[model samples]
Target: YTDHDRKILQLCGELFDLDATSLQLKVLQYLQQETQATHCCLLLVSEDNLQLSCKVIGDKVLGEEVSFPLTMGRLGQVVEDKQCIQLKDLTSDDVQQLQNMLGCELQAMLCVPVISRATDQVVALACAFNKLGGDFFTDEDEHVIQHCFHYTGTVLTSTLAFQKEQKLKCECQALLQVAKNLFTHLDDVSVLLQEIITEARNLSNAEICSVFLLDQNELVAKVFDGGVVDDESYEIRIPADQGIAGHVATTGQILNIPDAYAHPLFYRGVDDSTGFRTRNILCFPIKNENQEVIGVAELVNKINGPWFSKFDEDLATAFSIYCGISIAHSLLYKKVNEAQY
Candidate 1:
């Protein structure tokens, strides 16, 4: 690489991060320093909403969580027309009033939409206000940010796509160990479920978890974990068509009840017996090697939110298989003991 390549490559090297938020923040930081702008911000575009992701160098900086509609604001106009905007040599106080939340005096600004090379779609709005030392941003300043941030944007796109890959790879490693632990606990189903539900609570961020096996005409949960009710040990055995777990086991449907009491298939006995008010629940089927539903696993009340998310469902779907195979092996062993006698 030549001198230009050497410097640009260094900027690319700095963009190495799994978190898109921090990665974009660093881009604005370098953009301000290199472009010598007193203020900088990056707005991320997604689903017709523009989120003010990161801002810097203002007397008062705004949180990254701020957002607005797509068709509004100068930043929106830049993406609206797919062209960079430069408001230079401002004599109007209108521009001055714009900086109230920005907490800075605005003299000039260059707002450019950073486009992805692969898809050619606008990914972000990179804007720098008031070129340092009370000067307007030159045409070369506009050109400079376009390319410097072009490199930054391309590197970020690849990072995001591969970041997901890296995530699944790490989760696979975790699941591998999970399987190892489950298979080693072949001595008892309850013990195996204790390990499984602990991981279940961790993965889904749930207040409680229960694994119920399908046995003849009934659903049975010999092991569970949670808050409140966990202090008192109790066995759960209900009919095959009785409750949410029963419905999931019989119909092989995943149940995510945001309001537990309101659901038609909800079982109130557990709440009535233990006085543990379950505001929400997610019940997923556990299938055997032949893909037959052998059981169901329920996550009661996602601790961090109103309900468990889609990621929680997808992960629970994978983890339930590990439970199924472990429980299947445990059930087989229970039958073997009777035959030996």
Candidate 2:
């Protein structure tokens, strides 16, 4: 193989060899050295894929990292066009404006899109600015940057997938333990409901987790976190198809709502009654093994994060199965004891 091919392979190995926290730093450093740029940065796309934010920097004198919309300027243009871009020097005032906008000055800039291996979509970019020795980035430098970042993208994609897998495994184990605890307290209905809600809220990192069971043919709150309602008043019922939890129970489908107020299906009376502002919500139907919807698991206002995601829905869905089984077994046990008496 030629020298360029050899260097590309070597850089790919280096980028993937380390953990994710170090991957960004190593990739930025390598890009800066290879292109002889004064500063280099790696920008990762947000979960919504509509914005870019600096994830790592190679500059020794860098300030705080900042994010920008995809419609801002050259950075957006490169990701939009799916190609490399070389922007010439800007005026002093323009440079200062850019620094305010992006937390860095742009004298001369080269940016290349980084494709995600899992989705084959442009998800990030590597940026190089201020070519050393008072020189502009040549055509050859663009080729090197493009090739290296392509491999860098592969490494990053795989690293993210691995990290997600590890997290899912840990969450599954925690949920299993929660199931064991729920089953252990099946004789006590109140304690069982508390364990179910508390464990579900903690596992999903939700601000509030609640269980709404079928009482008198309506979905009623059996347990709720966040102190919105007293445990004694938890039995207040709602129409089986009126609110978020009601809808989930009636339809037997998962609802991962980013904004509850924006949805037509969301009912505002619950908010008014509880004196709590509802933002995002994730609700899943608690179903038994017979494919029957028993109740609903409702999660509200994610804690210190964005709205709920499909992964959270999946976790809640699995947890709901155990909830259904626990409730069914408890009811059966109570009936058997009363019959003997």
Candidate 3:
């Protein structure tokens, strides 16, 4: 093959092998060689939170101590605010000012925000600094940065999404296993509730969790986790419009509350009953195999963590849907067992 053909083939291979560590390094090294950049790094925003962190890079010295808030410095501005940061002269007056303000190195930079193709959320940042030309970055540099950022972000987020999808699949497998065991016996509803809530809490690293089953008419909570409230009477029933959970069950959709108490439909009576100050809550409807809403499940308090992510919502939704199916079958099984007795 011709040299040009071989080079193009090499680039294709590099881009295709993003997940392999050896290939990724070879790709970055080749890109650095082609661009004549002193250093190049890929920084991904934490999906768990929008925190900035380095994922992979060609520089060993800088990659070791890599982690900062998504809004930390001028570099962060690219990802946090979703813009491109192009510095013509790192030693210039304006660049110097920005560097002083950010307390980060002030060298010529061509940094661009990397957005996830699936959700369009700013998920990462890519940068190439200290050009071999020792000249100011130009429009050509912008073009390169933009192209690489787009392609890299697409590949990275796809990989990320696949990993998460696999994890949810694994969790669903485990949930099904547990469901099989639990479905064998029509036992105490309280024990069942505990099992469901504990599974969600552990999976999501939550401090508090709750499961609420809709009443026959789906207008009120027939049962809920008493662990969510302190007052025994609060265990009795809650009308469909009384709280966030009720509203979600009524509509048969997922509801995410970053601050549970602040939501307009949030009810404080539960807090008074349970003495547990509610915080962030990720709730979703549990639906049967026929896609009927039977109840709602939630992971609450986040175990001293921040608000939940879209991926978290997806994960919980998977669990809730499957758990809902299990619950519906169990209810049916119990009625059959009762009739036989």
TM-score of each: 0.45, 0.46, 0.40
Q: What clash pairs does model 2 have?
A: none
In candidate 3, list every pair of residues with a backbone clash: 229-274, 230-273, 230-274, 231-273
Better of 2 and 3 by TM-score: 2
lDDT of each: 0.71, 0.72, 0.64
Poorest 10 consecutive residues of model 3 by lDDT? 222-231
lDDT of 1 by residue, 1-341 (tens): 25445667787888767776566667777777777887777666764445434333333345644555553445665665778777652224425434654666667787788877777778777778878664667776677778776677876656655766898899999999889866765665566677777788888898888777788878877556542122224666789788788888888878778888898888899788878888888888888778888778788898869888898887677777777777677788878997898
* Candidate 3 residue lDDT tens string, 30-62: 557656776666666776655665545663523
The lDDT-based order of candidates, best leading, equals 2, 1, 3
Q: What is the lDDT of candidate 3?
A: 0.64
List where candidate 2 sits over 4 angstroms from the true fold: 16-18, 59-65, 89-104, 116-120, 164-341
- Candidate 1 achieves a global lDDT of 0.71
Give candidate 1 regions above 4 Å deviation. 1-3, 49-64, 88-101, 158-341
Question: Rank by TM-score, descending?
Answer: 2, 1, 3
